[PDB]
Design a binder for this molecule. Sequence first.
Ligand SMILES: O=P(O)(O)OC[C@H]1O[C@H](OP(=O)(O)OP(=O)(O)O)[C@H](O)[C@@H]1O
Ligand SMILES: O=P(O)(O)OC[C@H]1O[C@H](OP(=O)(O)OP(=O)(O)O)[C@H](O)[C@@H]1O
Ligand SMILES: O=P(O)(O)OC[C@H]1O[C@H](OP(=O)(O)OP(=O)(O)O)[C@H](O)[C@@H]1O
Lengths: 318, 313, 304, 312, 200, 203, 205
Amino acid sequence: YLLPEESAEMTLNQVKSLRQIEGRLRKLFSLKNYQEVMPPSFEYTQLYTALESNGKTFNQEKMFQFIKHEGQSITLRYDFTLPLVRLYSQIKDSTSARYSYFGKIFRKEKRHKGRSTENYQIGIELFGESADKSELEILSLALQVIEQLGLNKTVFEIGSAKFFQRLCQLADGSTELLTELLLKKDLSGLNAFIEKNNFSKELRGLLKEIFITNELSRLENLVTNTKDDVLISSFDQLKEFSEKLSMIKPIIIDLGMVPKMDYYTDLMFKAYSSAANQPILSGGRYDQLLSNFQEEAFAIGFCCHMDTILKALERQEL
Amino acid sequence: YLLPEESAEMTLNQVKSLRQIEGRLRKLFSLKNYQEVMPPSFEYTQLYTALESNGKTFNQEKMFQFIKHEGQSITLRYDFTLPLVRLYSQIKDSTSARYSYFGKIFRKEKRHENYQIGIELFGESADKSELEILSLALQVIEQLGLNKTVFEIGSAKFFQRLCQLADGSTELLTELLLKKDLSGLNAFIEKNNFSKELRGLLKEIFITNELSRLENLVTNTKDDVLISSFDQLKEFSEKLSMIKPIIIDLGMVPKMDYYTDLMFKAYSSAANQPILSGGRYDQLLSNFQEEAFAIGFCCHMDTILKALERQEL
Amino acid sequence: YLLPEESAEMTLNQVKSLRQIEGRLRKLFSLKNYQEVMPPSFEYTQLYTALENQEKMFQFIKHEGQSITLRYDFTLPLVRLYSQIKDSTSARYSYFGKIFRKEKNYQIGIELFGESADKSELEILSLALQVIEQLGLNKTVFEIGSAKFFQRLCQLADGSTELLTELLLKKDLSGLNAFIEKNNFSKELRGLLKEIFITNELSRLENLVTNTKDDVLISSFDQLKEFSEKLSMIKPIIIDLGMVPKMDYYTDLMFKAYSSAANQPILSGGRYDQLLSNFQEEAFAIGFCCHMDTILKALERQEL
Amino acid sequence: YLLPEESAEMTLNQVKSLRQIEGRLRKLFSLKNYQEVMPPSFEYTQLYTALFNQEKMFQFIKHEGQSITLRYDFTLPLVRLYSQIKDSTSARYSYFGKIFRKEKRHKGRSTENYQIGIELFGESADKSELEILSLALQVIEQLGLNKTVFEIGSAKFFQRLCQLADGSTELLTELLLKKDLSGLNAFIEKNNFSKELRGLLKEIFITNELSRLENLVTNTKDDVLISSFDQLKEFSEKLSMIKPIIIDLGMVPKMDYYTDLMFKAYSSAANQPILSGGRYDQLLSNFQEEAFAIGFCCHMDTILKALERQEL
Amino acid sequence: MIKIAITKGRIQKQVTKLLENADYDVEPILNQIKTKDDLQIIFGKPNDVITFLEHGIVDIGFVGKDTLDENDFDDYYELLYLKIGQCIFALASYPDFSNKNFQRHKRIASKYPRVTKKYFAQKQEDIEIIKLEGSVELGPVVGLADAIVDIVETGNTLSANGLEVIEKISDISTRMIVNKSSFKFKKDKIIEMVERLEDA
Amino acid sequence: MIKIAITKGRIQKQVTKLLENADYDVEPILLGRELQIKTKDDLQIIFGKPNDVITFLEHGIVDIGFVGKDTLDENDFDDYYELLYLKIGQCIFALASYPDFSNKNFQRHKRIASKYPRVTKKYFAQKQEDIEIIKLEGSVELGPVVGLADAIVDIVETGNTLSANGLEVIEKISDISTRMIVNKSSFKFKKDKIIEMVERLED
Amino acid sequence: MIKIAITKGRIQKQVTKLLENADYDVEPILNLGRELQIKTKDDLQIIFGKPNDVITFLEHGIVDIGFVGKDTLDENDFDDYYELLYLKIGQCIFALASYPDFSNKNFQRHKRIASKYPRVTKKYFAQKQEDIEIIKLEGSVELGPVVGLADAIVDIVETGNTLSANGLEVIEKISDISTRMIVNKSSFKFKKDKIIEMVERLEDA
Ligand SMILES: O=P(O)(O)OC[C@H]1O[C@H](OP(=O)(O)OP(=O)(O)O)[C@H](O)[C@@H]1O
Ligand SMILES: O=P(O)(O)OC[C@H]1O[C@H](OP(=O)(O)OP(=O)(O)O)[C@H](O)[C@@H]1O
Ligand SMILES: O=P(O)(O)OC[C@H]1O[C@H](OP(=O)(O)OP(=O)(O)O)[C@H](O)[C@@H]1O
């Protein structure tokens, strides 16, 4: 008759369609040599809480947990990356690993709203492979997946945490603030911000702009004018990606991008659908994570938010 | 690092393998017109403990549950058939439904996830249904890729009737059959004033499936119900022989208390547990909608995969 | 830091005050021959089933893999403890502790098993009234009711107990009228229903009941009337025919006492033979319980 | 039917007898001006783990979805309750209840541990230690146990001892706990320990004769050790009139946060201590500021057990 | 004395009115008061009147069934019930509603999620409830939801939008709720007022 | 072939004995230090302690296994078939203690010692009485002799061990005897041989 | 007087022996069999039993001093005692035995080890960082790897004659084993004298 509220219900069609895409992506992933892995459904909460990012993504209040026999605190799959990162540590051969996953994560969201609790994701991880090769391989794949999804109007955005980080330090080290500013594109708070400080013309001109434009030429200049090696350097890496992947799909460069996670190493990227409010795909490189376990290696990957993608597929037909 | 005793860990190869069979089965199912449905991950405890069993008190000890914001008891998917039986009650047009599912349930084990693949069939014609499911079940097995397997079928009507005839001691006989407790049976028979026939049968169903041997023993009882129930199974043994020799287990104990009549399970020699268990259970549909024909099986992927490994060696 | 929504903190004075009452009550009980028992803190979830929700009880799993629960109730463990006696004699138990439940609990009670029918009821009614006088509350009322009367009331109400119960609980006067409408009930039965909802005046009720030309109801009111008379000297008793049995297993007598300073009852009890039957045979089970929390909350809200 | 291993069952008499002792003790505490406090039944597990093992404590999840635990300890909540009072005065608390912790089955171990104890926060250093030791001794006289001993030790002495022993506390600790005489010898063997330090180590393990220890201590010529010992010696002489005190230099502080004074009282009819206490200022500075915290605890389960094994 | 709380809305009038038709010193001079009949009255929003009664800030409280049904509070008595007005909870939507048979669960927008839930429960149909505090008609208009559950009095609000009642949920009307403990002791006065307020 | 495991104890004798009378190839040298052997009837046999015999059968190490009811009731394992049951040993589970047991009315909880905790517990359950179970791996008679426990739950065959200590049976718990348990899977596929041997051993 | 418990096995011999060289009324040989409790001229009410039973007895204070092997003291969860003396006699040791090709083989599934001491096996595989499956065996743990039941085992290796005879070799020494003298804490608190006296004497020999 009636099921709980914290349970999403997919319609046959939704299932048929979700199961289609999987087929396409599955064939694609297997072709690029990614091995699928199924993470345990329960994890020791100690594993999830050891994290705090640049926002709101790892609090014990979003996760469903309870007590086991010996009496410890276990939690329902809250994230896919970690377990795959762990798996990679348990390896005794220093070789690259190509993992992929097709499941859902369980996190709590307020009541009486279109917010879903059951989040079905599809994503891949890449551990150990070469530095540049890595970044390129993932960005490519990410674009390929988007082509198989079947959404009409989509955008692929990339960015640099270093550029972000650097930017921050140039802004009087006010990262706690600049971040809030960038997240809300709070234009009136940024102006106020700039007023209280004695920022150079260039830096000020740059801040003001990165919040509202991705036109390469325009940004290119603003950057080189800061005469800052770091900022110009990071920006050129993005430009390079823009150029190398331009033939596949027009890339967009968002310098005002705020690192979803506080551990992102440098490259970060997300793609949006004109028919969805949330991103259909997000990913980037996060070597840092590999550190919590095994040594320093190149870790990067993305994740597809199927719920949103399917939602976009419907709001799309209408 | 370190994981729980609650969580299971499949190796790349196992997943590769699992995902392979799904492919084959998905193809099969879609070919037979079975739509896949994805049941919610959370359910109201009131739905499980309630429908699962009867007359007694079902167990909330095997299921992971907790409380919600409003203050209710929710449970992680404990079962697949129910939510699909529900999904069928919510339908208006009185037509047949062919559902399938590919996921896992969550139960606690007391000393050591449970990934299942199954299909349900609601509404279709009685005769046609039983035959349809048994074919399909047989067809699935051939895609699994296991070398030595057996397909067993039984009848709850036979079992139920068997119990009444036996001084209605179903509580006990069930326990005997379950442990194949031969000496216990002997003692059971001794205390009672049963017939030669009834006795001769009891002793046999416990240890053999030879069609001929049983056929007689049954007809000798001159019981319309037992001979009836048996023939229906004999019929299935004949119609499905060409596909794969079917085995009849008159000493089969209905897994669920709500099984209507036909019930079956398939085993692998490299598997202790059954790789495929199903049967007809109209009763369930009753919990919501009216009386209709509900029948379906379930493949226990875990066991099947375990069988595939312990097999290669 | 902060504390769980489940953890209640008493102030030194609350404790001093709680411990005082116990003291007075311990002396009272021991004088009436009630022996105190300390029921285990853990119990098998399977036992808390006799009361007919696991969502109100704290529970977890043991080493072997079972469902244990924090003391959710006091009566059962004591009833159990009485079963474990093959000596067919009366027992007078008392308990001073707390139970663990969830909603949005220190209790002090007594149980009486095996004693004579009529003597039991009277003894407990007395004791409940003597305890109240040791509490220290200024304005309180002692109400008594009859499940039989309630039950008989329902069957006469076209047996739609599920509804009237909901009506009496909310004193939903308009709903009752409507209810009387749809089912043309006899003038008497109707007349009674409208009243029991809003009055305990013995003279007023007495008549309405004897008019119902019903042996059961009149019989039940009489048992309460009697009580009213025999205990009147101790404390004016109040008869509430509109009382809804708190527990589905109450035999007949049931009672609760309230303070003007506390929304909830400070004392609730009654006879529930039914419970005894879960273990042993049929015997007379009856005993009340004081809700200390409420009693102390009332003591405070009282002084101001 | 029956009952679960997780629960202990006291007999009427056991209840009568426990409640009796509480009475005497209640009168005693109220006379010394000790106010009783009843700590919450549930605590945020974060409070317990933060100073143990979550594997000994019963826990579960609350509505909002956090980890709450059944009272596992009495001292903490009371310490907390003292932090909530900004009045920089002395506080005398007492508690009569039980804590819940898990144990192994079929060994006869209990889950529900009834305790009665007192805490003292804020009072003078020198005065506190004396008052507590006094009360502890008085309490024991009300229990009604025939043969008992009252042992006191110093954590600084222990700690000093450890540093003097090549600072290998991890090991010496284990040695003293098991009184591993042969393990001690071997320990002495491996590192070039000095005659004095050696003769001490060997001795503290198996004796409490004041005179004997006195010398051994002064011979080490260590200010800390002789200092610690004297403090103890003093208590020995001051409370000697009440009850012959016993000094255990081979005493291993039960809790890692013990400041210095620590003690335990045993019964000849009980394998576990009937009373154990000590000063632990460290706890207080985990909320408020540095103050003098000291208080004991009476293990009723053990005490009663002793009272029975005593009559036979 | 007797403490009363009334909802500031249209109900305040019904009450002040009824109190008049039965004699009590009506005082519409406000912009907490006392009357000559010992009635310290207080005013506020329904959910607030209830909140006052819950915390015993008052003994009697006059609110609408519509709120009482939505509000999770249950610890009170519903003695009197002045059947004034004609509001009714209903399920509104576009005419082509019942004829359309989509392939999934429907979404309803409502100011009363609990009622909306409770109703769709007896009807066997899990749904997505979207809450709206203002004008719920927009739900289906803007495309937010398929249907709505709101209070329909004259129906002048739905028609004007192209919506129609699909089914009557329940009858709505102003009620007289009373705090339990207040009724236990002040049972006389509370009853006296009930009997008087009833003669009208 | 058929893999069988037998308990090294007295039961080893009953089985090797029964097999004999069954016309089966006994190799009695089985007074022969190897752990694994073979017979002419395709019977790879193994030996060990009951709880182990059971462990071997549980993991599919062997198809048939001969162990005692006393162990089968205690061991928490359940997943097997108890086909045959050679009623030989006159062992029985019982509650032994000093004569003055039932007459004493203690206010405490009667603690019983036993080598079978689960059977002691299970038995005291149906009898309505929570108790303290003290486990003793051997000579459980001491329990009451040293004062460790008030009574005990052990197996009584002749009763020569209890009387020699002043102990007497208080109540018979259940009959004990050597049983033939079979691994379920082994029975769905080797169902023939398993039965064949079952019918023979039945004589 | 002093109540002592000794393990019936070989250990019994070791003790009876050491007691002799310490000059005691060692008389367990004469009332050897059906008798479980015996008194001496030195006020020693001695009792015999299996190790785990000796410890049980000591735990409940049925006896003040107990002689058991380290192998059991590590496995048995009990911990509330004093390991005063330590007669270094038996050269037994905990080891991880298995077939030679063990360390050379790469396993896919988890290594299942058979053992009579699951807690030691567990404890040992913890410090080595490796979650494993422990199969309990009360009898001859050598069979585990033989029949196919387990890959390796955790047992006590004295001479190594049992392993070699089956084609098994030690993979790693876990810890040294030896008969110890455990004492009940409380008993040591009040009867500290005698207990020490005996400890000093048993050490002399
Ligand atoms: O009498 P009817 O024509 O059927 O109108 C009834 C509706 O009008 C009122 O809301 P309103 O539109 O005033 O919005 P509000 O609740 O935000 O004040 C009322 O709450 C109903 O929703
Ligand atoms: O002949 P019965 O009267 O049945 O006695 C046989 C006893 O011997 C065995 O125990 P154990 O190996 O511990 O030897 P024990 O006789 O010294 O107890 C067995 O468990 C019985 O307890
Ligand atoms: O290294 P070794 O000197 O050869 O001695 C060690 C062996 O002795 C023990 O056997 P147990 O007493 O359990 O007898 P069993 O081997 O016959 O089971 C132990 O289980 C080893 O198998």
